[PDB]
Write a protein that binds this ligand. Structure first.
Ligand code: CYZ
Ligand code: CYZ
Ligand code: CYZ
Ligand code: CYZ
Ligand code: GLU
Ligand code: GLU
Ligand code: GLU
Ligand code: GLU
Lengths: 260, 270, 270, 260
């Protein structure tokens, strides 16, 4: 029985190679998550087929409709069997799907154009001269929406009431927007994605400040699935063997096409 | 029914209060884990009594006897119901007990006695004999060790990495023994060995000791790996899901990071 | 019964909200004084309706008619029951209305257009033509004025200090009139007067304007005197004691200090 | 009829005259408060006699005894008619006596012995290497005791549980204690007394940071007394005339027996 693996087009997590038009199956995808899925399948011992979620959303709830979209929706409604992807482990997600132990630590970070005038999140919030926004239908937006801290609350309130729309459909779109904003826009994204962008050409983006919070990426399975325990044990074994560190080094630092 | 919360004695997680002679119950102990347990109790309604393991070990399964000891050991055999303590999530432990999502990230770090400031126009520069784990492995004039019956020793024993395998080979055949019974024992050994002993311990305790007087220890290099502390729970228990959800709530609500900051960096003696 | 809260339109104390075209009631206005009124209502339980004076004046005695105008005027004759605004506690007002303890301290300050940073090794130094009120009085090239029907004008009118008497004598016989109807009008006059006009206003408004864009104004010299803003109340009203106790309680809590911080410096720039 | 004025021996508010042994009546006292009392009496038009309170306390409530001591106790129980003294206006005091409008602004300030490693009160609360305390039965101890802010709460908790006693009987005693502590003790007093001490000989003390809060000194009168309105109007007239500023300049800066 083949296992359907939902995943998102994210760099360096999943990429469609460079000449994928002549390739078929799992061979036309590459990245951190492809290698992670291969290792998970090898440890557990199942055949898998990589598929990209039709709509490029990580997962959220609609406007009072109680409908999950993205990979989380693909998992809840039985369309997918597992999700090897940069899926953040959150409260609202864990109540509907089973997350494994985190395989990558991360955090919310600010990326701007190339001493920074904002640095910390407080100075970014206080100064309205530079705009800041998050990915739409993601987990950082839901972090700010549910946040009760005064700085985070005020940042969220500014973000929701912004003219024009400060959110972005894709993190690539957000990176492009901060690139062509001439330093007038800031992007709130995961620290791993921020580092990957800042170590890639043409290196006009840099990360300021620290991490707003600490989270992790998990492998998600449908609630009450027989694969949850095996994939959790596989993640634990890979972490103890240093395979996750090797994969992160390979897809984040080994190539390094930037001057640093 | 009041369930028990087994826990190790470790600063800044659990420390006896100064006026604990006349105190009893969950007010004798203070630290990060005591109010972590308080927050867990607030989130999911139950009464809890803090306990300390008699043998004073985190937990490891003895070879040729297949018997778990320490916090994990007495959690497995039903003498405990939940273990809120700096317990590392490991594969061997996850097969006998249920773990929650990590509430604190950590890594294996190196502790050495802080060397004297080198002097040469007149600037004071920091010079150390060890800067990573590879130079620790290759060199032989400085001994190094870990905590017995802990996760660090088990990580070194089951390591196929060449440098870690070499370091474990040195550790196993060492005279006198380089392993210590308690973290405080390792810190005292480092402080008294005059730079001839390095202590391999978790990064959180390493930073906590570094920030406190007499601040004669320094942490060299980066973390050897990436792990986390989880709230342990007996296998097939009903507390696993509420504990997981409470950990997620505390993480997303800023309780965890503010607790870590006010137990680690607010009291910066040095 | 709903008690009405008369108030002047002054920033950062009271500002019309951006989406106040559709908003109605107490939600139309925002600022320091609306927060103060909310806290006062929280302390002593009452419903309050914010009201802006039609006259647009703080209040004074008109010439030869012995009639009060502005907030003080409409409070004396019963069109309002409490005044929560930057109203200055003065002797001439305390004889006709009841004042509470000052919720914010203030002084009379000098506002001039910020000069250009003088360039002479290659250091940039601030140079100003006026450094105190004495040199403002002795000099004649720069005009200066106050706000009409306000506390500053009455203070200069009834001053027996030689320098202040000289300044008042210049003010009374100035041509064209140096008195402005609104604080914003005086600030605009200073801004567009190319350094030929100086505005004498309360230190709080001076600092707030100095900290906000385009921030081309500067406050020269120290405060001319020491006064405070109180919450006004008609003589014999039963609200005097509860409002006084509320002011003292809010001062003790630090609510006043945090309101000042979040309405004066947190929102500032440049 | 004569009016009994209660006051405390405080510099530069009330001092014993240099040749007071041969002096009688109000002529043997001098300071800011003596001049203030003279001006208040001249404005209102009453005869007064300065009396120093037998117990050298400003006023507070005892341990669950509901008994007022010091000047506030002298006023509540009818032993005095008015109090021209550095009496801080507080909620607990205002409920039992009538305070006039403040005639002097002040605040809580930290004074130590002459790199400034203490700076603000936050670092004082964070570091226990240096000790700090307040005046016993004053208005600073009651401010810290009733404070709900975390920094002030922890400062008060440290101060109450101090071995040996950290509080001082008199402000002069606290000045001496910080003088002879060789920079190991800090004193929390009013900003006016702090300034007067810091510009006086031998100038070995200095004030750090800023004011912890904003308060004022008022003229206190028994509840429901015919003198409250006249003395309030007198204070307002003196402030509008600049007399209070002249008195503060004369007793704080005119002498100036230090190099500054
Ligand atoms: N250095 S890293 O981001 O590639 C990284 C991050 C992490 C790893 C392993 C690696 Cl290599 N394992 C941990 C897991 C292992 C066991 C302890 C915590 C979880 C369960 N999660 S983690 O702390 O998110
Ligand atoms: N900054 S820290 O070490 O105190 C820390 C570390 C971690 C926290 C929260 C904090 Cl405050 N929560 C995460 C958890 C939250 C959700 C995402 C990963 C796990 C599930 N684990 S963690 O990455 O080990
Ligand atoms: N820092 S400030 O100007 O906003 C400010 C100023 C003042 C405050 C409170 C604040 Cl926050 N309260 C005092 C009052 C409290 C008690 C002591 C003096 C009066 C009665 N008046 S004040 O000295 O005019
Ligand atoms: N500069 S000072 O400390 O001598 C000083 C301080 C103050 C003065 C007058 C002087 Cl001279 N008057 C005010 C009073 C006057 C009217 C306005 C506020 C009160 C009622 N109180 S104050 O703000 O506490
Ligand atoms: N990893 C995030 C992506 C969205 C974001 O960057 O906030 C998620 O799974 O929701
Ligand atoms: N926390 C570790 C023990 C500490 C250490 O080994 O340094 C464990 O769970 O075993
Ligand atoms: N607050 C002053 C008016 C402002 C001013 O005169 O500058 C008053 O009560 O009259
Ligand atoms: N001025 C204070 C006394 C000094 C102090 O408490 O610091 C009072 O009236 O209570």
């Amino acid at each position: 029985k083949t296992v359907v693996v939902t995943t998102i087009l994210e760099s360096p997590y999943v990429m469609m190679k460079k000449n994928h038009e002549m390739l078929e199956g799992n061979e036309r995808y590459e990245g951190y998550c492809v290698d992670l899925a291969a290792e998970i399948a090898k440890h557990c011992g199942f055949k898998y087929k990589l598929t990209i979620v039709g709509d490029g959303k990580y997962g959220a709830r609609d406007a009072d409709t109680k409908i999950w979209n993205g990979m989380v929706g693909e998992l809840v409604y039985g369309k997918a069997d597992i999700a090897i992807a940069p899926l953040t482990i959150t409260l609202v997600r864990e109540e509907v799907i089973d997350f494994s132990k985190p395989f990558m630590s991360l955090g919310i970070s600010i990326m701007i154009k190339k001493v920074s005038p904002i640095e910390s999140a407080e100075d970014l919030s206080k100064q309205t001269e530079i705009a800041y926004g998050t990915l739409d239908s993601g987990s950082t937006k839901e972090f700010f929406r549910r946040s009760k801290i005064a700085v985070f609350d005020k940042m969220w309130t500014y973000m929701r009431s912004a003219e024009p729309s400060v959110f972005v459909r894709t993190t690539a779109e957000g990176v492009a927007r901060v690139r062509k904003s001439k330093g007038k826009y800031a992007y709130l994204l995961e620290s791993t994605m921020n580092e990957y962008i800042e170590q890639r050409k043409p290196c006009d983006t840099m990360k300021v400040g620290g991490n707003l919070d600490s989270k992790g990426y998990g492998i998600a399975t449908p609630k009450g699935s027989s694969l949850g325990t095996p994939v959790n044990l596989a993640v634990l074994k890979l972490s103890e063997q240093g395979v996750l560190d090797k994969l992160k080094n390979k897809w984040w630092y080994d190539k390094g096409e930037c001057g640093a």
